[PDB]
Amino acid sequence: ANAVKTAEGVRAKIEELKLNLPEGMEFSIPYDTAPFVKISIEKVIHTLLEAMVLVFIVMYLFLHNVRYTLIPAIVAPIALLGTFTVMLLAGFSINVLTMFGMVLAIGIIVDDAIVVVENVERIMATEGLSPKDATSKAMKEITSPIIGITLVLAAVFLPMAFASGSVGVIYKQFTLTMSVSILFSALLALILTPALCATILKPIDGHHQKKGFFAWFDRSFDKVTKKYELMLLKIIKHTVPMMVIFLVITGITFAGMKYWPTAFMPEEDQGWFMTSFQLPSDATAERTRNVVNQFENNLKDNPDVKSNTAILGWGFSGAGQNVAVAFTTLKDFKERTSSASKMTSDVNSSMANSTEGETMAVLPPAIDELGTFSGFSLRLQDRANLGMPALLAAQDELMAMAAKNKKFYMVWNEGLPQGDNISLKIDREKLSALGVKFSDVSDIISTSMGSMYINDFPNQGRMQQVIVQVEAKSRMQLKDILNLKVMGSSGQLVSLSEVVTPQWNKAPQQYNRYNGRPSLSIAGIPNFDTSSGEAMREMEQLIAKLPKGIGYEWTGISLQEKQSESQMAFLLGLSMLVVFLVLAALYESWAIPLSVMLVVPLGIFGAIIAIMSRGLMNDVFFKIGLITIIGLSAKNAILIVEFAKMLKEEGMSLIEATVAAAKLRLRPILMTSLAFTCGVIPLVIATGASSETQHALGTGVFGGMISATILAIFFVPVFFIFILGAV
Amino acid sequence: GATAKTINDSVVTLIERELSGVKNLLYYSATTDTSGTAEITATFKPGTDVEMAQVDVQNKIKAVEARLPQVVRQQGLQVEASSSGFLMLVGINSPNNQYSEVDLSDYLVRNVVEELKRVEGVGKVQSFGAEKAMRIWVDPNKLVSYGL
Amino acid sequence: VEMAQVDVQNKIKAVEARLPQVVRQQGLQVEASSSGFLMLVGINSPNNQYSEVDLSDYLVRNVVEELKRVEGVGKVQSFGAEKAMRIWVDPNKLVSYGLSISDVNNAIRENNVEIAPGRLGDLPAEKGQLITIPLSAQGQLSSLEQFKNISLKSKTNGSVIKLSDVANVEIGSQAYNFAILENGKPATAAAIQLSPG
Known part of the structure; x- marks a missing residue:
């Protein structure tokens, strides 16, 4: 079913019931979630539209004429409009995970059309050649990269689509939206853009009066591509001490990916939290009402709070008299100071001194139907018949260790605690000695405390019930049960x-x-500055100190997190093995596809650096960023080493070939790179609601593409000389 | 009426005997408390079709209803695949203290909560109030004074 | 095999109006199985320590319940029954007192009864109530000695006789249908049938 649509038909249905209400009854909806579902999706669509115009600006800063820029600008929506049909025929939907896959796609679907319009910009300016004949001489050079760049980049997202668990469904939304968008942009770079470039371009001659702010950009770029060749010609002399830096760079990443903390999904502020109360086991509901009323008077003077409903007598994980749960809704984001994760702590400090029971304010979960609250879920189960009092005596061993670890913050137990019972033992021999029938003793006890439903009766147009129960003043103490009287003989x-x-x-x-x-069912939230996987592994350390025979398991969000961590080394293995195989099919050798698999850790090197400077974790959004860098940094390698190998067989040696091949393609490499870098700027600097889930996806590919391109254009001419220069 | 000790022996352990064998499972749990009802939750693998997995469990508990007590079968056994969360929370109050809370909850059951389920996509609606009834509060001291 | 199983589940619920009550009070199982035996797990006693009513009692309480927790075990047929309280009445001593077997049945129902528990301080409550607590009463019987003292009211002279005077009370099997040899010596076993698919 649908969240925002079912919530509106309820909102409509209440609006017709305003008419038949009596005087003195008002409807109220003090708790809703679909306000957040609508705000979060337009925040992603507004992110995508800002992502388009920032890509459109840097395409205008390189080609200097707006007719050039619209030729790869219009292949962006038709590639995205062609993907919306494929979502429909495959049973997909429009959610934030698919549309995050399009924000990632905007920077790369323009790349297959950027190379074409850039290449005719050279040939129309170098030889002074007419644009119809210029396009055919361009397409006879660059058809082989784009048919290689497309298969090398559509094939990295296919091994990750076949993962298991809940992480496999998150990877699919990114697979289908990002694989067939580049596949649609591939043909639209070969079919559509030569049709535009042969017609809508009139021959540009040299501006005798060249002027403007753009005029500094063209003269400085020929200063940079003159400066880039002089620096590149220096380091291929020192190619053996440049390789020894490369082992050091890979070593920081192999330890940086194994020692940095891990998580599953970053948790957000959704405008509401949830308090849960648990008094001892014999608390009546008058005692629960006094605990809730003290919780209410601490939220009457905070300015940030809109409403606070309470349901006495019922809660998640158990219902009873000593049980309540409160839903508390905050104001919207621009008015609010003191966002929600601070406000749950102020509840958990003023309600630990006075109010008779366990009061725990928690934050809402990341994924809705994986849990009730954000944290980790543990099932401390016994496995060999140890009995219930041994297992309950086993958890307060575990609950005592976790109160002193600084990697935790209020581990607790979900469920009703133990309590007292009263059992009566009927003395039969005496009963028979007084002539008392046992049948009359056994039903003056049965019908003494429960309620009895007899039959129905019509109450002004409806059949309601007739219930018989003993009076409230004679079922309170034990001594009112021990004064019922039965007739003897x-x-x-x-x-x-x-x-x-x-x-x-x-x-x-x-x-x-x-x-x-x-x-x-034991729960717990990890400490401040400590990730989920750190707390998830110190819990299974303390389980090993328990009495023997007490097992454990993970459930809920935690089981899907541990399952996501066992598959990364396999999914990163296949995603690097597939591209190495498909490059040998294209470049027809084994040595050349080894010169592309060395640029792969140079982009992973920036992926971990940009995390540690910002303090994020290793979650499922970072692992989507890693497979993005594997395909995209290979792209910047493939543009150089393809034109180098072709230049060598036409009559050049190894050293002079890669110098020319890197020089003649500096302009397309920088164009596609910083278009993807400026294509994820609104993912990094987001501010409002649902901002934290954009920071996780974006800061990995941001520093990964910067550290790719600034390191690649000095390193693939080092690798290509050294690998083919063995013998 | 009964304690969770008895439901764990007579009802709960009989139904989880059948669920170990339902295909595409991940895990399954059960819980009981003082209210007098139990609930058993079977969690399947992500991607399993939610209706063809619901017909699997409907096959199996009808193979144990011979052994359940009568008061369970005279109240039936609901099997329903839901979300375990709250979409929204519709309420009714009285600001001038006109109607008491036994009248507001009576108005909610007779009128509001029945037509809220006619919206498609509303799985279940939990009402936290009950409609009216005819309550007889007997005094067991005046009853034995007459021999009743 | 499952979309064919839902076809037959559609149809017999269209005839349960016409079946007798004692069928519906025992239900109708519909189960798609193999009609063969995968394996046959047994328990014996070589030193003749436990008899066969004890071995079959051990098999039902412990073994055959956890054998079904293995996935792919369709059904497990046990060829022994757990223990019960067997009353072997003598119909000649019953008519000497003027009793019937319907009077022996009614005496057990009065004296081995299940009392509904209830609580103390349930929620239509007084003002100022502080403690709630569950309450319950042991109504049933537990041993043999209690069952041999259920008093019966005679109809000839109005005497007071116990249950042990008109019957014989013992712990025995619930049903006496099947028995098992394994190598010429009595034992018990359970037959395991594997699931479809």
Whole structure:
């Protein structure tokens, strides 16, 4: 079903019931979530439209004429409009994960058309040649990169689509939206852009009066591409001490990817949180109301709070009299100071001193139907018949260690605690000695505390119930049950206190179960400046100190997080093995596709640097960024080493070939690179609601593409000389 | 009426006996408390079709309803695949203290919560109030004074 | 095999109006199985320690319940039954007192009864109530000695006889249908059938 659409038909249906309401009844919706669902999706669409115009600006800063820029500008929507049909025929949808896959795609679907319009900009300016004959001489040179660049970049997202778990569904939304968008832009770079460039371009001759702010950009660019050749010609002399830096760069990343903390999904501010109360086991509901009323008077004077509903007597994970839950909704973001993760801490400090029970304000989960709250879920189950009192005595061993670890912050248990019972023992022999029938003792106890539903009766157009229960003043103490009287055989009444004997004991009030085993459901939130996987591994250290026979398991968000961490080394293995195979099919050798697999860690090197300077984690959005860099940094390698190998077989040696091949393609490499770099600027500097889920996806590909291109254009001419220069 | 000790022996362990064998499972749990009802949740693999997995569990508990007590079958066994979360929360109050809370909850059951389910895509609606009834509060001391 | 199983589930629920009550009070299983035996797990006693009513009791309480937690075990047929409280009445001693078997049945229902638990301080409550606590009463019987003292009211002279005077009370099997040899010696076993697919 749909969140924003079912919430509106309810909002419509209430608006017709305003008419038949009596005087003195008003509707109210003090808790809704679909306000956040609508705000978050237009924040992604507004991110995509700012992503288009920033790509359109840097294409205008390089080609200096607006008719050139519209030729790869219009292949962006038709490639995206062609992907919306494929989503429909495959059963996909429009969510934030698919449209994040289009924000990533905007920088790369222009790349296959940037090379074409750039290449006719040379030939129309170098030889002074007419644009119809200029396009055919351009297309006879660059058809082989784009048919290689497309297959090398459409094939990196296919091994990650076949993962398992909930991370496999997150990778699919990024697979289908980013693979067939470049596949649609491939033909639209070969079919459509030569048709435009042969017609809508009139021959540009040399501006005898060349002027403007753009005129400094063209003269300085021929100063830079003169400066780039002099620096490149220096380092191929020193090609053996340039390789020894490359082992050092790979070594920081192989330790940086293994020692940095991991998580699953960054948690956001959704404008509401949720408090949960748990009094002891014999608290009546008058005692729960006094705890909630103290919680209410601490939120009457915070300015940030719109509403706070409370449901006494019911909560997630158990219902009883000693149970409540509160939904508390904040104002919208521009008015609010003191965002939500600070406000849950102020609840958890003023409600730990006075209010008789466990009060825990938590934040809403990342994914809706994976849990009730953000944190980790543990199922402390016993596996060999140890009995319930041993298992309950096993958790407060575990609950004592986790109160002193600084990698935790209030680990607790979800469910009703233990309590007292009263059991009566009927003395049969005495009962038969007084002539008291046992049948009359056993039903003055049965119909003494429960309610009895008899039949129905019509109450002004509806059949309601008729319920019989004992009066409220005679089922409160134990001594009101021990003064019910039953008739003997002699003729006078015998009270129940003579024939029964009450005895107290202590037994659990809730019998959970998990995978066929008795269990307890332990929860917990990790500490400030400590990730999820750090706290998830120190919990399974402290489980190994328990009495023997007590197992454990992960459930909910945590089981899908541990499953996501075992597959990364395999999905990064295949995604590098596939491109090495498909490059040998194109470049017809084994040595040349080794010169592309050395540029792969030069972009991973910037991916971990940009995290540590910003303090994010290693989550599923970073791993989407890694497979992006594997394909995209190979792209900047493929443009150089393809034109180098062709130049060598036409009659050049190895050293003079790669100098010319890197010089003649500096302009397309810088064009596509910083278009992708400026294509993820609105992912890095987002501000408002749903900002944190954009910071995770964007800062990995930002520093990864900067450290690719600034390192690639000095390193693939080092690798290509050294690998083919063996013998 | 009964405690969670008895539901764990008579009801809960009989139904989880059948679920181990439903295909495409991930895990399955069960819980009971003092309210008098139990609930068992079967979690399947991501990608499993939610209806053809619901017909699997409907096959199996009808193979154990011979052994359940009568008061379970006279109340039935709901099987329903839901979200375990709240979309929204529609309420009714009285600012001038005109109607009490037993009247507001009566108005909510007779009128509001029945037509809220006629919206397509509303799985279930939990009402936290009950409609009216005819309550008889007997005094067990005056009852034995008459021999009743 | 599943979309064919939902076809038959459509149709017998269209005839349960016409079936007798004792069928519907026992239900109708619909289960697609193999009609063969995968394996056959047994328990014996070589030193003749436990008899066969004890071995089959151990098999039902412990073994055959956790064998079905293996995925791919369709059904497990047990060829022994767990224990029960068997009352072997003598119809000649019953008519000597003027009783019937419907009077032996009614005496057990009065004296081995299940009392509904309830709570103390449930929520239509007084003002100022501080403690709630569950309450329950043990109504049932537990041993043999209690079952042999259920009093019966005679109809000839109005005497007071116990249950042990008109019957014989023992712990025995629930059903006495099947028995198992394994190498000439009595044992018990369970037959395991594998699931479809």
